[PDB]
Write a protein that binds this ligand. Sequence first.
Ligand SMILES: Nc1ncnc2c1ncn2[C@@H]1O[C@H](CSCC[C@H](N)C(=O)O)[C@@H](O)[C@H]1O
Ligand SMILES: Nc1ncnc2c1ncn2[C@@H]1O[C@H](CSCC[C@H](N)C(=O)O)[C@@H](O)[C@H]1O
Lengths: 338, 339
Amino acid sequence: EAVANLIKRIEHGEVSDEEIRGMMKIQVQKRLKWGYKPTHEQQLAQLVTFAQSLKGMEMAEEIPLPFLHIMCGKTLKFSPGYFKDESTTLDESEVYMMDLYCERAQIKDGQSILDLGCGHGSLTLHVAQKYRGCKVTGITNSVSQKEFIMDQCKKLDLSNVEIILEDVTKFETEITYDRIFAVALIEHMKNYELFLKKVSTWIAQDGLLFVEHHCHKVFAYQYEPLDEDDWYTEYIFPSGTLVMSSSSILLYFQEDVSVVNHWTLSGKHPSLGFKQWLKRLDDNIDEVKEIFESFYGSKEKAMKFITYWRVFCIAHSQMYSTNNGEEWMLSQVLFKKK
Amino acid sequence: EAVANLIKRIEHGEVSDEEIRGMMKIQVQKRLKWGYKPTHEQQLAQLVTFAQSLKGMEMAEEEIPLPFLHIMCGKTLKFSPGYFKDESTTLDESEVYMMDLYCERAQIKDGQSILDLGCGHGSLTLHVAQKYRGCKVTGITNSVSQKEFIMDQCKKLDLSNVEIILEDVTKFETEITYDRIFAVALIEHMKNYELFLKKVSTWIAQDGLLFVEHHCHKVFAYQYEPLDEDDWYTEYIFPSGTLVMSSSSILLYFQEDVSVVNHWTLSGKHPSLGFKQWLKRLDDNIDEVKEIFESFYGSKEKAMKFITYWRVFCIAHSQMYSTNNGEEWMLSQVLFKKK
Ligand SMILES: Nc1ncnc2c1ncn2[C@@H]1O[C@H](CSCC[C@H](N)C(=O)O)[C@@H](O)[C@H]1O
Ligand SMILES: Nc1ncnc2c1ncn2[C@@H]1O[C@H](CSCC[C@H](N)C(=O)O)[C@@H](O)[C@H]1O
């Protein structure tokens, strides 16, 4: 009704960025009041019941490279950076975070490395160049992502990268790997039990699996609108029904792997990154328009996608900033095979 | 150290119950300030670091008159919390309510083999054996007098499905496996949960389950080390060893040999009310308690030291579990399967 009509106003510029923030603040408080319970007994039961529900699901149920070069940092990382102090640039945050992944996943030169859902190869190429004795295998289901990475290997003279074009949920191999990364991938999964069971078979003897997931600190939820006045949910997530995990949810999925270590990082880090994405978009908006008009085939369709990404950045920067980054945040889990 | 004189003053009856309660409220606020951190990153790191420290430790560190337990405890001599539906619920009712809750949550069925680790005076061992005559129930305790009490109860109650093994659980070797294992208020006596759960996991039969209940803090874990030089509680209540207060989530990090099927907590109101009932029963029978302790401990002064211990124990722990409407210290129940 108005949920369709309010959007078009935003796309015309009738809604300022601060009004967008004010709207998402309303969305945030409704989600938080929905998720929190007055007793720990109820709060825990809500989580366990949610985790059990994922076990009755399937394991799981496009963006122009020139645009990603503008919005994302130099490594095209499609996942948060680590900000030491916001003199930290977007480019610096990508490297800081990937070195943190390497430290926490206990990467050693010479190991075989598997990067599941490698995207445009930020971590695949980071590890391959930093540890030249490693063999790094990335898996992506995107032809253009694989082609970009293989082209980077040429420009960078890398001989130790292989990219496999597959659906991770259907992939099968007899090969095992010393280290497996899944950075911002379980966000696209539903039955974590089946996902971790399959991945576990790929872990070599004494190997490790490192997972980073966006989450809320306490509770988990499917992206379903909260009431009639909720537009964010189906605007940002039009199709499918994905899951926002909680920081502790993977602790309940240790049938085939066991937790070695578990960390969280404050929502400040993803918030600062989304702010940088928006700034880069805005500072180059004319070039963004030409890229999108060429790819999407018209001015109006180009500006709908531009509005999407701006709202995406503004809304998620507000969400992750909530209460000094102590609501939505990042969870990193290190697993060994079990 | 004037802490000794404080202790000797409590024993001679010059420190009121309200003073003990107030002392514990101060202790509680200190422990909470110590444990809580301003960011989840720090809070979680504190818990994971603590869990990892247990993995390098020993499984555990290397006698109460029966007539006293008959007075203080409920009818089944349960040395662990009851479940209070209302505050019409009596102590005796709370024991049965809780043991029936254990049977429900551990999915107990007639005919199963049951192992009750650290069975104490047999509240749950006897509860299950009486309820399910096709079950074979084995309890393990390291106390001769506890075993003898349970076997005497088996005579009185005409039960033939109970065996009590007299053993230290941390050194116990068996190749028997069991459909259901209980560890109720036992890991409170353990340090290396990893080593403990590894050993117990070998006793779980095919498709079997292990049910653990532990007292805990909701968020953080700690060893019973004094917080400062004014802390009397820690070393008065725990005159030996470096025992551990678990957190409600800590066993989630010990799933190498067992994996979590379900996980619940219950409010600190339940243990709080139980300790209040223990104290009331002690006080309502103080003359016999003195008679029992004067005989067992010989001197009226040593008897007073031990009466005082149990009163302070009940007062302080009732206060501790009541903190913030029962939402700080509480009970955690975890159901595990093998592998
Ligand atoms: N079943 C599947 N098989 C392969 N890739 C998948 C997948 N489901 C999702 N993905 C991909 O996984 C990625 C998650 S985004 C993160 C990409 C990369 N890890 C980084 O940090 O930059 C996306 O590129 C998405 O298209
Ligand atoms: N290593 C060990 N071996 C056997 N029993 C032990 C033990 N360490 C502690 N215990 C016993 O475990 C019991 C914990 S108190 C709880 C007893 C019983 N589960 C109940 O709920 O009533 C005490 O009896 C204590 O002495």
